[PDB]
Amino acid sequence: AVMTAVRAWEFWNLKTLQEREARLRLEQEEAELLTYTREDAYSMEYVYE
Amino acid sequence: SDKKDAPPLLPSDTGQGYRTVKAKLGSKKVRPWKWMPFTNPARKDGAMFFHWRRAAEEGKDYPFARFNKTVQVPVYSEQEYQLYLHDDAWTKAETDHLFDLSRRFDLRFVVIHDRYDHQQFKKRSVEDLKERYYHICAKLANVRAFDAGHERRRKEQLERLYNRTPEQVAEEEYLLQEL
């Protein structure tokens, strides 16, 4: 019974991990950045170089 | 415009949470904006319109008036046409119409010819108008003191090259590069 429970838990853990990874990818899908800061907007911030 | 990419990035202050900037905002206040009537100095007729401004700049001036530049036009009414701006194929009416229209369309020759009235005056091509405008400008310069034919050759060369039937296009373009 303990072996069966351990194997079943391994499969449940694997499935939950795959589901969490799918949810994380779905999270990544949305555009992570929409705005920036003001001191990083009107002070030239960078050169192409 | 775009090529179907990520959305633009915009300036923001309340990134973080308005717990950082609570102090930077609470200590200051806004300059009172007002909906105010203005008249652009670029307007020949002094009409007035509304728009949002700071109530400290009210009625100051319209910054876009400096975009109101215009290009010059020659002048002739009774005798300058005969004495200096002579012509033997164009009437005063046709010249004046073409000049007023060129001002309409700001010496953009293609759409100038597009409008050029074909039923008040006899037909003619774009380069005729262009060269005639050059001639009038030269005459004005003299009193007040590159080649059109090759451009026609242009138009015809492009017309021949493009009207070329597709198979001949392919064959000639092969012949074009081989040697």
Side-chain angles (χ1 to χ4, degrees):
Chain A
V2 156
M3 311 192 12
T4 303
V6 165
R7 179 176 275 275
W9 193 93
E10 278 275 289
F11 279 117
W12 171 90
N13 172 63
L14 192 62
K15 186 182 76 88
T16 302
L17 285 195
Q18 287 180 0
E19 288 177 14
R20 193 214 302 291
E21 200 255 314
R23 186 134 40 80
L24 288 166
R25 208 170 332 81
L26 176 141
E27 292 295 290
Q28 171 302 341
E29 107 187 292
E30 282 133 38
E32 57 163 31
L33 287 173
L34 293 175
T35 71
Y36 39 105
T37 62
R38 174 177 296 271
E39 72 313 353
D40 190 13
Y42 308 85
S43 299
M44 167 302 315
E45 328 311 344
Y46 161 106
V47 287
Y48 180 22
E49 178 48 45
Chain B
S1 292
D2 53 63
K3 70 286 181 203
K4 203 287 299 166
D5 314 85
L9 249 61
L10 265 57
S12 91
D13 278 326
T14 55
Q16 288 68 320
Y18 178 76
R19 164 147 210 294
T20 326
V21 278
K22 161 147 60 71
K24 186 184 324 304
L25 307 184
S27 49
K28 316 177 83 82
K29 60 162 59 179
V30 293
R31 291 173 261 198
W33 287 73
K34 195 164 66 173
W35 207 27
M36 48 139 264
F38 83 113
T39 294
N40 345 51
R43 274 193 162 272
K44 183 177 280 284
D45 160 352
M48 72 50 57
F49 297 150
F50 289 73
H51 79 156
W52 281 110
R53 234 61 172 194
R54 261 184 173 160
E57 319 328 284
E58 184 157 26
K60 170 191 325 323
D61 51 26
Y62 200 53
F64 303 89
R66 326 194 62 256
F67 305 110
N68 190 35
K69 313 303 294 298
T70 61
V71 58
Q72 291 84 354
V73 189
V75 61
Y76 58 88
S77 66
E78 67 190 356
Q79 55 93 350
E80 329 88 312
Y81 192 103
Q82 306 94 292
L83 268 69
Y84 334 111
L85 281 49
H86 52 44
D87 202 302
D88 58 354
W90 258 5
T91 81
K92 286 201 301 188
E94 197 169 342
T95 42
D96 187 36
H97 148 283
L98 174 287
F99 281 10
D100 158 8
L101 181 279
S102 187
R103 159 42 298 169
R104 193 171 263 291
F105 305 174
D106 188 2
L107 49 75
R108 312 295 276 210
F109 37 57
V110 47
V111 154
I112 276 163
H113 148 283
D114 204 85
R115 166 36 50 240
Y116 162 94
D117 201 315
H118 267 329
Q119 49 91 50
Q120 302 327 60
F121 301 101
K122 189 250 169 195
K123 301 176 70 69
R124 52 180 73 267
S125 72
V126 309
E127 313 178 31
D128 324 296
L129 290 296
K130 184 73 149 57
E131 58 82 29
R132 258 296 298 102
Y133 201 172
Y134 180 8
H135 306 359
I136 193 98
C137 287
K139 293 319 305 289
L140 273 312
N142 324 125
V143 47
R144 307 304 178 81
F146 194 87
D147 169 30
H150 278 324
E151 276 293 340
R152 317 177 227 301
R153 292 276 288 275
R154 215 55 31 71
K155 324 314 185 188
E156 302 326 305
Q157 199 261 25
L158 287 316
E159 175 55 29
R160 156 265 196 257
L161 272 166
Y162 214 66
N163 209 18
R164 182 168 36 172
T165 198
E167 53 271 354
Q168 168 41 312
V169 201
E171 311 335 284
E172 201 178 275
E173 277 70 323
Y174 166 22
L175 299 169
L176 221 36
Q177 64 85 7
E178 191 55 33
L179 74 180

PDB file of all heavy atoms in Angstrom, chain B residues 162-179:
ATOM      1  N   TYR B 162       7.991  48.655 -68.094  1.00  0.00           N
ATOM      2  CA  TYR B 162       6.963  48.009 -67.285  1.00  0.00           C
ATOM      3  C   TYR B 162       5.867  47.372 -68.131  1.00  0.00           C
ATOM      4  O   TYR B 162       5.400  46.275 -67.805  1.00  0.00           O
ATOM      5  CB  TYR B 162       6.351  49.011 -66.304  1.00  0.00           C
ATOM      6  CG  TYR B 162       5.954  48.384 -64.984  1.00  0.00           C
ATOM      7  CD1 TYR B 162       6.915  47.865 -64.124  1.00  0.00           C
ATOM      8  CD2 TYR B 162       4.623  48.303 -64.601  1.00  0.00           C
ATOM      9  CE1 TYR B 162       6.560  47.287 -62.922  1.00  0.00           C
ATOM     10  CE2 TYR B 162       4.260  47.727 -63.398  1.00  0.00           C
ATOM     11  CZ  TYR B 162       5.232  47.221 -62.564  1.00  0.00           C
ATOM     12  OH  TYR B 162       4.878  46.645 -61.367  1.00  0.00           O
ATOM     13  N   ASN B 163       5.442  48.025 -69.214  1.00  0.00           N
ATOM     14  CA  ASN B 163       4.440  47.428 -70.087  1.00  0.00           C
ATOM     15  C   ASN B 163       4.965  46.174 -70.768  1.00  0.00           C
ATOM     16  O   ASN B 163       4.176  45.408 -71.335  1.00  0.00           O
ATOM     17  CB  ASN B 163       3.986  48.445 -71.134  1.00  0.00           C
ATOM     18  CG  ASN B 163       2.555  48.222 -71.583  1.00  0.00           C
ATOM     19  OD1 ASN B 163       1.777  47.546 -70.912  1.00  0.00           O
ATOM     20  ND2 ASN B 163       2.202  48.796 -72.727  1.00  0.00           N
ATOM     21  N   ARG B 164       6.277  45.957 -70.729  1.00  0.00           N
ATOM     22  CA  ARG B 164       6.902  44.749 -71.246  1.00  0.00           C
ATOM     23  C   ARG B 164       6.156  43.502 -70.782  1.00  0.00           C
ATOM     24  O   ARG B 164       5.904  43.324 -69.588  1.00  0.00           O
ATOM     25  CB  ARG B 164       8.351  44.713 -70.764  1.00  0.00           C
ATOM     26  CG  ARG B 164       9.179  43.554 -71.252  1.00  0.00           C
ATOM     27  CD  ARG B 164      10.663  43.778 -70.946  1.00  0.00           C
ATOM     28  NE  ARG B 164      10.891  44.468 -69.679  1.00  0.00           N
ATOM     29  CZ  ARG B 164      12.080  44.637 -69.119  1.00  0.00           C
ATOM     30  NH1 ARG B 164      13.183  44.178 -69.687  1.00  0.00           N
ATOM     31  NH2 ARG B 164      12.166  45.287 -67.962  1.00  0.00           N
ATOM     32  N   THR B 165       5.811  42.638 -71.735  1.00  0.00           N
ATOM     33  CA  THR B 165       5.030  41.453 -71.415  1.00  0.00           C
ATOM     34  C   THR B 165       5.844  40.495 -70.545  1.00  0.00           C
ATOM     35  O   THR B 165       7.049  40.331 -70.752  1.00  0.00           O
ATOM     36  CB  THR B 165       4.579  40.745 -72.692  1.00  0.00           C
ATOM     37  OG1 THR B 165       3.495  39.857 -72.393  1.00  0.00           O
ATOM     38  CG2 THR B 165       5.725  39.961 -73.316  1.00  0.00           C
ATOM     39  N   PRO B 166       5.194  39.809 -69.595  1.00  0.00           N
ATOM     40  CA  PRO B 166       5.952  39.154 -68.511  1.00  0.00           C
ATOM     41  C   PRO B 166       7.069  38.239 -68.984  1.00  0.00           C
ATOM     42  O   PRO B 166       8.180  38.277 -68.430  1.00  0.00           O
ATOM     43  CB  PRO B 166       4.864  38.367 -67.760  1.00  0.00           C
ATOM     44  CG  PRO B 166       3.580  39.037 -68.115  1.00  0.00           C
ATOM     45  CD  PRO B 166       3.752  39.523 -69.515  1.00  0.00           C
ATOM     46  N   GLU B 167       6.814  37.422 -70.006  1.00  0.00           N
ATOM     47  CA  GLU B 167       7.853  36.523 -70.490  1.00  0.00           C
ATOM     48  C   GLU B 167       9.055  37.309 -70.991  1.00  0.00           C
ATOM     49  O   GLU B 167      10.205  36.946 -70.713  1.00  0.00           O
ATOM     50  CB  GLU B 167       7.298  35.606 -71.586  1.00  0.00           C
ATOM     51  CG  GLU B 167       6.593  36.313 -72.746  1.00  0.00           C
ATOM     52  CD  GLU B 167       5.108  36.535 -72.505  1.00  0.00           C
ATOM     53  OE1 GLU B 167       4.581  36.045 -71.484  1.00  0.00           O
ATOM     54  OE2 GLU B 167       4.466  37.200 -73.344  1.00  0.00           O
ATOM     55  N   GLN B 168       8.812  38.407 -71.711  1.00  0.00           N
ATOM     56  CA  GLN B 168       9.926  39.199 -72.210  1.00  0.00           C
ATOM     57  C   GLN B 168      10.631  39.858 -71.029  1.00  0.00           C
ATOM     58  O   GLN B 168      11.855  39.988 -71.019  1.00  0.00           O
ATOM     59  CB  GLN B 168       9.413  40.255 -73.195  1.00  0.00           C
ATOM     60  CG  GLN B 168      10.385  41.373 -73.621  1.00  0.00           C
ATOM     61  CD  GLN B 168      11.819  40.904 -73.882  1.00  0.00           C
ATOM     62  OE1 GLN B 168      12.417  40.184 -73.103  1.00  0.00           O
ATOM     63  NE2 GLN B 168      12.373  41.344 -75.005  1.00  0.00           N
ATOM     64  N   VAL B 169       9.879  40.247 -69.998  1.00  0.00           N
ATOM     65  CA  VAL B 169      10.526  40.771 -68.796  1.00  0.00           C
ATOM     66  C   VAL B 169      11.544  39.766 -68.283  1.00  0.00           C
ATOM     67  O   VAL B 169      12.721  40.090 -68.084  1.00  0.00           O
ATOM     68  CB  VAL B 169       9.493  41.117 -67.704  1.00  0.00           C
ATOM     69  CG1 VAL B 169      10.083  42.104 -66.728  1.00  0.00           C
ATOM     70  CG2 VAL B 169       8.241  41.735 -68.289  1.00  0.00           C
ATOM     71  N   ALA B 170      11.118  38.516 -68.105  1.00  0.00           N
ATOM     72  CA  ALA B 170      12.027  37.511 -67.566  1.00  0.00           C
ATOM     73  C   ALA B 170      13.225  37.304 -68.487  1.00  0.00           C
ATOM     74  O   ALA B 170      14.379  37.295 -68.036  1.00  0.00           O
ATOM     75  CB  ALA B 170      11.282  36.197 -67.338  1.00  0.00           C
ATOM     76  N   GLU B 171      12.975  37.153 -69.789  1.00  0.00           N
ATOM     77  CA  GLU B 171      14.069  36.859 -70.710  1.00  0.00           C
ATOM     78  C   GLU B 171      15.064  38.012 -70.778  1.00  0.00           C
ATOM     79  O   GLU B 171      16.276  37.801 -70.686  1.00  0.00           O
ATOM     80  CB  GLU B 171      13.535  36.527 -72.106  1.00  0.00           C
ATOM     81  CG  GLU B 171      12.409  35.499 -72.151  1.00  0.00           C
ATOM     82  CD  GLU B 171      12.413  34.553 -70.964  1.00  0.00           C
ATOM     83  OE1 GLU B 171      13.255  33.630 -70.938  1.00  0.00           O
ATOM     84  OE2 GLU B 171      11.574  34.730 -70.058  1.00  0.00           O
ATOM     85  N   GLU B 172      14.574  39.243 -70.946  1.00  0.00           N
ATOM     86  CA  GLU B 172      15.472  40.389 -71.039  1.00  0.00           C
ATOM     87  C   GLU B 172      16.249  40.588 -69.746  1.00  0.00           C
ATOM     88  O   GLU B 172      17.462  40.827 -69.780  1.00  0.00           O
ATOM     89  CB  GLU B 172      14.685  41.653 -71.388  1.00  0.00           C
ATOM     90  CG  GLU B 172      15.538  42.754 -72.003  1.00  0.00           C
ATOM     91  CD  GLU B 172      14.727  43.973 -72.396  1.00  0.00           C
ATOM     92  OE1 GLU B 172      14.159  43.976 -73.508  1.00  0.00           O
ATOM     93  OE2 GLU B 172      14.655  44.927 -71.593  1.00  0.00           O
ATOM     94  N   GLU B 173      15.579  40.490 -68.595  1.00  0.00           N
ATOM     95  CA  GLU B 173      16.293  40.591 -67.329  1.00  0.00           C
ATOM     96  C   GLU B 173      17.338  39.496 -67.162  1.00  0.00           C
ATOM     97  O   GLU B 173      18.363  39.736 -66.517  1.00  0.00           O
ATOM     98  CB  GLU B 173      15.296  40.592 -66.170  1.00  0.00           C
ATOM     99  CG  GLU B 173      14.710  41.978 -65.898  1.00  0.00           C
ATOM    100  CD  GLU B 173      13.759  42.451 -66.981  1.00  0.00           C
ATOM    101  OE1 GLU B 173      14.024  42.174 -68.170  1.00  0.00           O
ATOM    102  OE2 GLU B 173      12.758  43.117 -66.646  1.00  0.00           O
ATOM    103  N   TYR B 174      17.120  38.306 -67.724  1.00  0.00           N
ATOM    104  CA  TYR B 174      18.214  37.343 -67.804  1.00  0.00           C
ATOM    105  C   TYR B 174      19.325  37.898 -68.691  1.00  0.00           C
ATOM    106  O   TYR B 174      20.493  37.956 -68.291  1.00  0.00           O
ATOM    107  CB  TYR B 174      17.707  35.999 -68.345  1.00  0.00           C
ATOM    108  CG  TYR B 174      18.789  35.017 -68.790  1.00  0.00           C
ATOM    109  CD1 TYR B 174      20.096  35.101 -68.309  1.00  0.00           C
ATOM    110  CD2 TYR B 174      18.481  33.960 -69.635  1.00  0.00           C
ATOM    111  CE1 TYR B 174      21.068  34.202 -68.706  1.00  0.00           C
ATOM    112  CE2 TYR B 174      19.449  33.056 -70.036  1.00  0.00           C
ATOM    113  CZ  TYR B 174      20.738  33.178 -69.565  1.00  0.00           C
ATOM    114  OH  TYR B 174      21.701  32.275 -69.955  1.00  0.00           O
ATOM    115  N   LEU B 175      18.968  38.325 -69.905  1.00  0.00           N
ATOM    116  CA  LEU B 175      19.937  38.939 -70.800  1.00  0.00           C
ATOM    117  C   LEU B 175      20.584  40.151 -70.152  1.00  0.00           C
ATOM    118  O   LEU B 175      21.736  40.482 -70.454  1.00  0.00           O
ATOM    119  CB  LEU B 175      19.254  39.350 -72.107  1.00  0.00           C
ATOM    120  CG  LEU B 175      18.610  38.233 -72.933  1.00  0.00           C
ATOM    121  CD1 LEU B 175      17.756  38.813 -74.053  1.00  0.00           C
ATOM    122  CD2 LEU B 175      19.667  37.305 -73.500  1.00  0.00           C
ATOM    123  N   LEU B 176      19.858  40.821 -69.259  1.00  0.00           N
ATOM    124  CA  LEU B 176      20.383  42.017 -68.610  1.00  0.00           C
ATOM    125  C   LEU B 176      21.618  41.693 -67.781  1.00  0.00           C
ATOM    126  O   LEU B 176      22.641  42.381 -67.869  1.00  0.00           O
ATOM    127  CB  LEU B 176      19.293  42.634 -67.732  1.00  0.00           C
ATOM    128  CG  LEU B 176      19.087  44.148 -67.686  1.00  0.00           C
ATOM    129  CD1 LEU B 176      19.330  44.764 -69.038  1.00  0.00           C
ATOM    130  CD2 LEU B 176      17.681  44.467 -67.199  1.00  0.00           C
ATOM    131  N   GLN B 177      21.541  40.638 -66.968  1.00  0.00           N
ATOM    132  CA  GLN B 177      22.606  40.328 -66.023  1.00  0.00           C
ATOM    133  C   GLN B 177      23.717  39.481 -66.626  1.00  0.00           C
ATOM    134  O   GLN B 177      24.856  39.556 -66.155  1.00  0.00           O
ATOM    135  CB  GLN B 177      22.026  39.604 -64.805  1.00  0.00           C
ATOM    136  CG  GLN B 177      21.409  38.243 -65.118  1.00  0.00           C
ATOM    137  CD  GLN B 177      22.428  37.116 -65.133  1.00  0.00           C
ATOM    138  OE1 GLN B 177      23.595  37.311 -64.792  1.00  0.00           O
ATOM    139  NE2 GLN B 177      21.990  35.930 -65.540  1.00  0.00           N
ATOM    140  N   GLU B 178      23.417  38.675 -67.646  1.00  0.00           N
ATOM    141  CA  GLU B 178      24.386  37.690 -68.112  1.00  0.00           C
ATOM    142  C   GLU B 178      25.681  38.355 -68.566  1.00  0.00           C
ATOM    143  O   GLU B 178      26.775  37.931 -68.177  1.00  0.00           O
ATOM    144  CB  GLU B 178      23.783  36.857 -69.244  1.00  0.00           C
ATOM    145  CG  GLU B 178      24.610  35.638 -69.623  1.00  0.00           C
ATOM    146  CD  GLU B 178      24.890  34.730 -68.441  1.00  0.00           C
ATOM    147  OE1 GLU B 178      24.028  34.641 -67.541  1.00  0.00           O
ATOM    148  OE2 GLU B 178      25.974  34.111 -68.408  1.00  0.00           O
ATOM    149  N   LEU B 179      25.578  39.398 -69.382  1.00  0.00           N
ATOM    150  CA  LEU B 179      26.767  40.102 -69.854  1.00  0.00           C
ATOM    151  C   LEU B 179      27.214  41.129 -68.819  1.00  0.00           C
ATOM    152  O   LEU B 179      28.409  41.320 -68.597  1.00  0.00           O
ATOM    153  CB  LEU B 179      26.511  40.789 -71.201  1.00  0.00           C
ATOM    154  CG  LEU B 179      25.648  42.057 -71.238  1.00  0.00           C
ATOM    155  CD1 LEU B 179      25.536  42.563 -72.668  1.00  0.00           C
ATOM    156  CD2 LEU B 179      24.269  41.826 -70.657  1.00  0.00           C
TER     157      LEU B 179
END
